[PDB]
Amino acid sequence: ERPTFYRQELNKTIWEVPERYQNLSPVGSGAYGSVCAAFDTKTGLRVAVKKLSRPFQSIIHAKRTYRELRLLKHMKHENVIGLLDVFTPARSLEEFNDVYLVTHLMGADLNNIVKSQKLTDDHVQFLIYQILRGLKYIHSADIIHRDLKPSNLAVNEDSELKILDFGLCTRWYRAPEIMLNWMHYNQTVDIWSVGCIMAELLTGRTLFPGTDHIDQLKLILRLVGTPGAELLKKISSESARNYIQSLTQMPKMNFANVFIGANPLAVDLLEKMLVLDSDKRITAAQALAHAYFAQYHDPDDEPVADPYDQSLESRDLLIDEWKSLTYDEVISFVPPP
Ligand SMILES: C[S@](=O)c1ccc(-c2nc(-c3ccc(F)cc3)c(-c3ccncc3)[nH]2)cc1
Ligand SMILES: CCCCCCCCO[C@@H]1O[C@H](CO)[C@@H](O)[C@H](O)[C@H]1O
Numbered sequence: 269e270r271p272t273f274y275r276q277e278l279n280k281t282i283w284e285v286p287e288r289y290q291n292l293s294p295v296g297s298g299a300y301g302s303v304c305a306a307f308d309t310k311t312g313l314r315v316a317v318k319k320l321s322r323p324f325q326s327i328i329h330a331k332r333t334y335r336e337l338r339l340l341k342h343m344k345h346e347n348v349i350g351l352l353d354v355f356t357p358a359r360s361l362e363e364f365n366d367v368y369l370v371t372h373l374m375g376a377d378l379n380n381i382v383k384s385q386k387l388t389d390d391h392v393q394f395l396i397y398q399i400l401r402g403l404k405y406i407h408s409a410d411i412i413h414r415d416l417k418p419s420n421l422a423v424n425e426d427s428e429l430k431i432l433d434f435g436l437c438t439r440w441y442r443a444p445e446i447m448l449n450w451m452h453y454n455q456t457v458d459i460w461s462v463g464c465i466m467a468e469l470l471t472g473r474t475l476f477p478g479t480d481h482i483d484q485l486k487l488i489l490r491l492v493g494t495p496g497a498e499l500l501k502k503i504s505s506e507s508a509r510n511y512i513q514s515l516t517q518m519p520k521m522n523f524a525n526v527f528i529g530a531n532p533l534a535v536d537l538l539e540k541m542l543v544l545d546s547d548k549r550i551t552a553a554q555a556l557a558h559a560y561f562a563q564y565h566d567p568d569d570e571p572v573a574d575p576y577d578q579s580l581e582s583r584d585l586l587i588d589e590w591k592s593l594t595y596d597e598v599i600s601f602v603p604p605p
């Protein structure tokens with residue numbers, strides 16, 4: 269049984285949606301497509317509905333539409349954006365051209381909730397605990413976020429937090445190896461970001477507000493020191509090793525004299541997150557077991573994902589192949605409990 273759809277002009281196109289979604293009100297448009305807030309009469313929930321723009325305009329658009337859908341369908345965790353619904357007005361493949369995605373309405377990001385204020389230690393424990401819990405899940409699926417920052421973090425007024433992959437509402441939270449276009453990366457690029465987020469929550473200041481790419485690097489090296497010999501050993505590029513070999517060696521500052529007054533557990537966790545050598549950074553699961561999170565840690569409700577086959581989305585296919593693939597993802601969607 270199909271729901272009854274209704275047609276309505278919004279953000280300069282005809283939106284066509286099930287009647288369960290009421291009171292459509294645009295929150296944003298862009299090249300990606302646009303979004304309305306709505307009330308979902310069926311669940312009683314305030315929801316965001318995204319209408320993809322030009323989803324099947326080209327191979328690249330089609331490919332991306334398929335990845336976005338597939339990723340959304342696989343993310344099922346309290347601290348990660350998930351899918352409430354996916355729908356198309358289309359009744360067959362032959363007429364399939366629009367894709368709408370539904371999730372909880374999110375009216376505020378982490379910036380919007382903290383507003384450059386120091387938070388209490390307890391409040392930072394809660395926020396960070398959740399980021400890390402979502403990241404354990406995400407990383408267990410063999411995914412690296414790669415651009416974790418306060419704008420990619422949805423936080424309601426109960427400080428309940430979800431990781432996003434789009435700015436809801438800088439380069440300051442990026443791992444130094446991402447800033448340096450390092451060919452390889454591990455999941456601890458995201459742990460670096462968490463450390464930057466956590467420092468700023470504690471202190472009320474951006475940790476490394478560089479004015480540009482190199483000023484950013486200088487600020488980082490100042491806190492965490494220049495590469496040691498173990499780290500230099502693992503540099504492939506002759507130009508990167510010759511650059512480093514020519515730096516005046518600086519020592520890693522004492523984080524106790526940077527985070528004056530902070531809980532000593534908080535300083536300890538930060539020392540473990542903000543190691544230059546990414547092989548040396550704490551992992552999410554490890555950070556979740558750290559004493560800093562004693563009050564929130566439950567080793568039995570820190571769930572993992574089935575690894576996520578990213579090969580199916582990096583194929584080189586034809587428009588109408590990606591579109592039928594995407595159409596099957598729509599048809600197969602099972603609403604969550
Ligand atoms: C690339 S651009 O900066 C961009 C901006 C916003 C969004 C954007 N996408 C969504 C959104 C909506 C429904 C979904 F199912 C998935 C994502 C939202 C959203 C979700 C919940 N409440 C408010 C807004 N914002 C996507 C891309
Ligand atoms: C759905 C929210 C879960 C977070 C998973 C985010 C996965 C993001 O994955 C990232 O996407 C970028 C392009 O936007 C790529 O350039 C990066 O290489 C990639 O790591």
Ligand SMILES: CCCCCCCCO[C@@H]1O[C@H](CO)[C@@H](O)[C@H](O)[C@H]1O
Nearest residue numbers: 444445450452453454502544545546
């Ligand atoms: C001058 C500033 C240099 C920044 C040093 C970045 C060190 C990051 O750490 C490196 O991460 C790589 C993945 O990117 C791994 O392959 C390396 O083994 C690891 O040491």
